[PDB]
Amino acid sequence: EAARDGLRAVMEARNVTHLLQQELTEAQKGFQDVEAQAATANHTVMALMASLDAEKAQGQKKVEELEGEITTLNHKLQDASAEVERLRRENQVLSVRIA
Amino acid sequence: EAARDGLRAVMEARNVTHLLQQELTEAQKGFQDVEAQAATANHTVMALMASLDAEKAQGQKKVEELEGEITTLNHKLQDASAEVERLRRENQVLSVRIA
Amino acid sequence: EAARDGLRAVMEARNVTHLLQQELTEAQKGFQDVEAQAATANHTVMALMASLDAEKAQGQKKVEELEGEITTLNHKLQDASAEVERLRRENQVLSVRIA
Amino acid sequence: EAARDGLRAVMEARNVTHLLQQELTEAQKGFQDVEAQAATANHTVMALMASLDAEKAQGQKKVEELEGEITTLNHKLQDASAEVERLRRENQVLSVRIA
Amino acid sequence: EAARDGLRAVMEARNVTHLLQQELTEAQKGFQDVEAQAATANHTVMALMASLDAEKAQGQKKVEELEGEITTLNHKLQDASAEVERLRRENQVLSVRIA
Amino acid sequence: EAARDGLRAVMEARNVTHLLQQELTEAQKGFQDVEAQAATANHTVMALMASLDAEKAQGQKKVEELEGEITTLNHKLQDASAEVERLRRENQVLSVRIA
Amino acid sequence: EAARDGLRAVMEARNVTHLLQQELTEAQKGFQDVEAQAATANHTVMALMASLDAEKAQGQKKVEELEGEITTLNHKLQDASAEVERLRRENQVLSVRIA
Amino acid sequence: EAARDGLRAVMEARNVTHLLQQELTEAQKGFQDVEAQAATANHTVMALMASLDAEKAQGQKKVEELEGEITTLNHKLQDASAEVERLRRENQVLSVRIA
Amino acid sequence: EAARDGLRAVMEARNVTHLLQQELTEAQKGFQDVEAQAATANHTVMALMASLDAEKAQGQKKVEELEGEITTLNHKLQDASAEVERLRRENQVLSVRIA
Amino acid sequence: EAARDGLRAVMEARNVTHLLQQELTEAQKGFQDVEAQAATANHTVMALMASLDAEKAQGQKKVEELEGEITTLNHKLQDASAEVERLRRENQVLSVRIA
Amino acid sequence: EAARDGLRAVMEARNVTHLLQQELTEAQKGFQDVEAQAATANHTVMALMASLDAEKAQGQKKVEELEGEITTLNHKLQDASAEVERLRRENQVLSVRIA
Amino acid sequence: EAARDGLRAVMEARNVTHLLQQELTEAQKGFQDVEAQAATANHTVMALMASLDAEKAQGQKKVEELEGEITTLNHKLQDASAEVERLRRENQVLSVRIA
């Protein structure tokens, strides 16, 4: 009668451990998903950080190309303007002689 | 979603280990009771053996006694009956010596 | 870092439930052994009681028997002795009748 | 003796159920932490996506600016070089007259 | 799919041993009832043998007792008749002594 | 490792359930023998009871017979004692008539 | 003698069921570990698939970006070549006039 | 009557051990199927890892190709645009001569 | 059930037949003793007839001897009586002469 | 099979009991006739004994009667004889006077 | 005397034969009843054996009906599967023409 | 004469009662043999009943196994069957383009 009760008790405990074990399998599936979600996010962060680096570097290099081109064009404009002025003077000098 | 369903399951699982600890308590109670009752039952067995052994040794010795008395009486009866018979014969031989 | 610790915990918990189930297995065996031993012990009590009652009854009836046989013998012996005596007197009367 | 084993079984079971509880506590702390990371990380993804956009748009606008500067400088260069030659001819025409 | 059928099979294998275990108990009870009845049967056989022997003894002794009252009474009757006869002679002798 | 441990557990089980079957065969043998052995004990009980009823009828009737002889002898002794007493009185009256 | 063997038999049968149960407990543990492992594995497959997908989507996007850039540069390169040829023709047309 | 209930219990027991044998067979098959499946699962993990790597390497190679195309087109865009500016000044130089 | 009652009746009938066998021994003995008694009574009748014959013969002869003695003594008594009378007349005649 | 043999043995037992019953009627008649016979012999012994006692006592008495008669006659003979002798002497005396 | 004892035993014998008759009636009823029972028992055994044969036969037939249903489905499944494979290769061939 | 016929009848009765005794033994054996039969029949019935129950259990279980197999096969078949139809319509659509 006391062996009845105990035995019943131990059997309920068995069925409950089994209910528990299951939930441990739901838990685990839950972590794993949560891990994957986080791992994925950490991946994107890294991917995007790298992209931002590359895009800074490319944009920076392209600017320094163009600015190099601008300066070269300026030096050539300087010489062309010098030449114009030189010719303007030399024009007014010749202009006086005859008229 | 899945962070939540996994959490939900760890929570449930936690709750259930309270049920378990209860069944384990009932079970503990059953075993302690079972031990008390075994102790009662063995005392009885021991008391009963003791009585039976007491009762045998006594009966065996008592039977021995009465059987010694019986054989003794038998040897006496044999003699006394052989004595009657021999006097009966002796008598009849003498009474013929008269009549 | 926390995803891992948590998952670890869920797996460990699992390992633990096994251990649980194992002790539950042992607890179940114990109570089945206990019920078997109780059932046996009750049977012994009843066996022993019934052997005590049968040993008392037997002893008391054997004592009856043997005492019966004794007093019978006593009555026979008294009679044989009383017969010897009277045959001894009757002899002495007839022998005086000759000498 | 079998009650002894069993009840010991049940006491270990109890102790195991505690260890279980503990591990389930840790599992729960870790989910929550894992969830919280997901949130922080998703922010940084959304923040980095927006910075990458802002940087593509900005760089594109700077290039367009500098490219606009280069064409202007090219127009000026042409015009000056035109002006140089126009003077040169007009110079030699004036040159001829007097000498 | 298979891991689940396996577990499902084991859990049924367990339920069914528990069935085996009850039948073992019934089985155990049946053998003990058998011994008890055999042992009862033997008790009754011995008690009847002892009653038989005691009845033969009580009857032998009762036959002795009564036969001893019978022969005692005979001797008294025979004596009472010899006393009658001798007082009848002695009477006649005296009445002759008068008339 | 864990699939193997279980597989191994299931194989051992399978072997174990064979042993079980063996013992269950022995158990079946044991009961079938018993039912045979039990009818014998009853036959004897019945026989012995028959003997004991028979042996009691004989005594009761024998006791009837002798008790009848006894009461007959008593009534014969009555008359004879009533005679002695009347002759004793008659005697005493006559011997007063002499002394 | 036969109730001996039958009983001994049933008692062995019992100790055998304990052995059974033990092995069933190990089998249940194995299935549960095998399913936990299955769940990890299915999860990994899924994580890995989804990473493979995201790697292809990323690369697919980056390629489309670059290929648009290439078409732009070809539209610009054509124009420049069209302009070179136009100027060559207009160069030779003006070349013929004077010379 | 108790021999019966004992024997019937033993007969059920025996039948039951046949069902046990069968469930143990299912259980054994299940473990073997589970094992086969783990092996397929590890294969797919391996393939998928290996494909992820190839995809990373492939994409990196495709980009590097396209970036090589983009720098080429840019060098050609430079040479044509020098050529066009050279021609534009040589157009306006000749342009003024005649008009 | 019905097999017990019948077996019971057959065992009762067996004991009854042992009785019957005993009462037939008693009946046999009676007839043999009663025949011995008829024989003895017949001898006695014959001896009593022999004795009555002997007694009547002896008696009748004695009477005759005495009756003959008587008549002889009658004859002698007449002769003497007649002589007396003759001598009285003869004496009275001589008495008349003398005186 | 066994139930037919038995039933048959029972029904033969029945018929034999009927035969028994018949012989016992005859036995009963024997005794009754034998007792009637012994009565008649007893009357004959008693009549013969009484005829014997009458014959003897009668005859002894007759003898005394005759012997007394004989002595009475012997006395009368002596008187007659004495008278003759007296008358012969008395006559011879008167004879001596006369002649 | 001896004739009374005999006559008494014969009257007892008679009354014993009446008892015997009674018991024989009971034995006869016993046999008739036990034969009726044997018939019934043997009817039950025959019905059960037939029932057990039905049941085996029914199960064995039902297995065959299902296994045969299974092999058919396996044929259909192989045709269908075969057809998919065929169509896929046929589709890929047409797919190689078009794109 | 009558004391012969009566002794004769007692002698014959004595020989009959030996006959009776013989029949009773036979009747006895008959019962003991009929009882043993009854017991054998009873075991057989029980055995058959237990056999039947096992056969119904084992059968029912086999069916379940097969019916379950049947359903899983009906599932697979529907997928393959849907896949064919699908590829047929898909194939006819590509067949319409080409020819």
Ligand SMILES: [Ca+2]
């Ligand atoms: Ca342990």
Ligand SMILES: [Ca+2]
């Ligand atoms: Ca093990």
